[PDB]
Amino acid sequence: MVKVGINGFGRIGRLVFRASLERTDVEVVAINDIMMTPDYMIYMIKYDSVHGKFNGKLEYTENSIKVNGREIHVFCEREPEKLPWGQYGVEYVVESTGVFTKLDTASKHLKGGAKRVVISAPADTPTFVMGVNNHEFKPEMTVINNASCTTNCLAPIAAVLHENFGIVEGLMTTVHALTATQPTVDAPSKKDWRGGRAAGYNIIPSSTGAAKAVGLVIPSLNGKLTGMAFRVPTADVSVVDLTCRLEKPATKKQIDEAMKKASESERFKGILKYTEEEVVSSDFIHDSASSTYDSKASISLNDHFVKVVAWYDNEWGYSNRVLDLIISTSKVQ
Amino acid sequence: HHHHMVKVGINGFGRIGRLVFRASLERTDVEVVAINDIMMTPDYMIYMIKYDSVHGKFNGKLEYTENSIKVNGREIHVFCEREPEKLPWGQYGVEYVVESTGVFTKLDTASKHLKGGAKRVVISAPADTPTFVMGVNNHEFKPEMTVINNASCTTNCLAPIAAVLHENFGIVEGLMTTVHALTATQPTVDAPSKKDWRGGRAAGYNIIPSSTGAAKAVGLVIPSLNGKLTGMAFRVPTADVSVVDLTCRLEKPATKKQIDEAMKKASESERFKGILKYTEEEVVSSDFIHDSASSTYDSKASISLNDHFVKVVAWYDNEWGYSNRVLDLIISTSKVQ
Ligand SMILES: NC(=O)c1ccc[n+]([C@@H]2O[C@H](COP(=O)([O-])OP(=O)(O)OC[C@H]3O[C@@H](n4cnc5c(N)ncnc54)[C@H](O)[C@@H]3O)[C@@H](O)[C@H]2O)c1
């Protein structure tokens, strides 16, 4: 078992934790969050507005929680440099506070004896998408990141189109569920004015590096994609809308068959999924895929110009990929 | 000199017909003198006119009688007929009838209003009649076209944008997405929708893929674009205001700055004034509530991958813009006899 510490017990931190309870090869042994105490922490585990109630046994002390009888240490430390991760045998720290997305600060987790760090967001570190480039990990890379939820949805789709038909150029939109960075009312957002507007009552254009980032995980696509986002009032589950020009001709049937084949390959099993059903966003709540290709919603203008639609639970799929990446890179020493 | 004030009848006081009516109260180039409906009585009509969850309260005197309503002293006759051939529009001086039943789109069907005395009919939706978008092809109207339609709100947003791109740089091909506010055809809970399974799912709690013919229909108002665009929609939980997201390949190289200039110049032209607007501000959808443009180009949100491949973002109040375009089309075609 790989012993994991979680820094920042938020939407991603708490769902990484629930996901870990379903795995036999990884175990969360320590949690840090400065806005919680252990008794409050088990309340936040128990009740979840998106993913429902957790029904296992939950107990607390003043410095630990117990989940189905297993004790997990709880820190409350604002500075990563001060977290004694090594004292509790933590091998990997999940860095999911949202405020240490830099190699500079995320590396301070190693000072306390963690051995590796996975940042749960894009960062100035090696970047990985499971299914696409996780086998490029090198053992000296002590601090890495798992990209964004959007990159994890788009990269498998782009790899299938590019490998089968070749992507000449592409532009992406993601229609994205609300996240914690948005306010409930019109509020200050110095670096992103539109992002300060009331989240629940607006379609809000937003910038994203996900399409560019696909060029980092798929090098031959460097410079050939870009895109943007619209934030909309839903609680969870987002969708990628990728318009691209293909080098070689592909009928809509050939695109469907390529996506279906890919969803059945060892490389993308559980990561890229395939549907022909009349689905809507809530149908992917608690679906652990990184990407589900929507055959009926995707459309072609012609054999060289297509719009592909792919769904992702931005909370649950990404959290499961964080654990997948930890397991994958842990085998590389 | 000036043009006459066109007398209009509204058939179907549903959401579109009622917003056309409200738009006409804010204006002086047209007046609605008669309203027909069968799900409403005159006292209930003034309640729906007075209060609006999107567009605010109407300030002005509203009264009702057994067969009419009064706005600021002016009497408007209210009908409750089933077979529109008997409707005596001509007795009340009605020149144009706005067909906002949300059903009637058969050419002969809509023509029944001419038996009562109306001269012309505008269908407030796509239909198997001549099709028009203000600023794009309204000057193609011929006086023998007694029944016409104003396309859809999405086509009225997309077509001005496509005209500027196509005329300045040339569209080779394009794929469009519209992220669209809720409409009345969607239910509040998961409910049967036999011709559209996704569209029966609860509207307020889902992103819902949907079909739209709007990108293909651009070929009807811009014939050289026939077969060069298609697209789709995502319905999302907002009350009003939608956005077109158009990904285009261009013939002539265009920098992002040249695209901005072309949209800006179009917004200042007599052809597109008040129809296509331009912004460089950090806007969000609620900033377009009660904005009567067909389309507002969003400079900061639009993005170019290269000089030949661009994504253009354009906002539209799907309720208020289209309602004002219906009245504009009435007026524009009334001048052609
Ligand atoms: N929510 C998503 O859909 C999603 C998907 C992929 C990646 N991410 C990324 O993952 C990160 C977390 O996002 P989230 O949505 O879980 O955020 P969140 O606001 O729900 O959680 C952040 C947590 O960090 C805690 N925290 C803040 N500063 C801390 C500190 N100094 N020490 C310890 N704890 C601290 C907060 O109390 C909070 O519980 C962000 O970088 C975000 O961009 C989010």
Angstrom distance (rounded) from CA A90 to CA B240: 50
Cβ atoms of residues A319 and A301 within 8 Å: no
Q: Say how many CB pairs under 8 Å bridge A and B.
A: 126
Residues B114 and B198 in one domain: no
Residues A158 and A244 in one domain: yes
Q: Which amino acid is at A268?
A: F
**DSSP labels for A214-230?**
HHHHSGGGTTSEEEEEE
Task: Give, using CA atoms, the residue closest to atom 44 of ligand 1.
Answer: A12
Reported structure resolution in angstroms:
1.8
Q: Atom 29, ligand 1: which residue's CA is nearest? A: A97
Distance CA A4, CA A1 (A): 9
Burial of A252 (0-12, 13-18, 19+ CB in 10 A): middle
Residues A166 and A251 occupy one common structural domain: yes
Retrieve residue A298's tokens: 């995707």
CB A106 within 8 A of CB A125: yes
Co-location of A220 and A237 in the same domain: yes
- Residue B66 sits in the same domain as residue B120: yes
Residue A297 is part of which domain span? 148-314
**A155 and A200 housed in the same domain:** yes
A122 Cα: distance to centroid of ligand 1 (angstroms): 13
Tell whether ligand 1 has an atom less than 6 A from the beta carbon of residue A235.
no
Please state the atom number of ligand 1 nearest to the C-alpha of residue A13: 16
Distances (CA, A) of A139 to A93, A135, A143, A333: 16, 11, 10, 5
Same domain, B70 and B142: yes
Can you give the length of chain A in residues?
A: 333
Say whether both B137 and B9 belong to one domain.
yes
Same domain, B164 and B286: yes
Structure tokens at B199: 């569209």
With beta carbons less than 8 A apart as the criterion, state whether A225 and A170 touch. yes
The residue among B141, B126, B138, B94 whose CA lies nearest residue B113 is: B94
Distance (Å) of CA B106 to CA A2, B145, B147 = 68, 14, 10
Together in a domain, A184 and A103: no
- Asked if residue A222 and residue A332 are part of one domain, the reply reads no
Q: Which residue has the CA at smallest separation from atom 20 of ligand 1?
A: A10
d(CA A315, CA A310) in angstroms, rounded, equals: 15
Q: Which tokens belong to A228? A: 């943007």
Q: Which CATH number does the domain housing residue B242 bear?
A: 3.30.360.10
Residue A237 Cβ < 6 Å to ligand 1: no
CA distance A275 to A259: 10
CB-based contact A305 B249, cutoff 8 Å: yes
The three-state secondary structure class of A134 is helix
Q: Pairing mode, if any, of strands B30-36 and B6-11?
A: parallel
Q: Are residue B323 and residue B311 in the same domain, yes or no? A: no
**Residue spans of alpha helices (H) in B56-174:** 107-110, 113-116, 153-168
CA distances from B63 to A332, B44, B68, B69, B77 (A): 80, 11, 9, 6, 12
State the total domains in chain A.
2
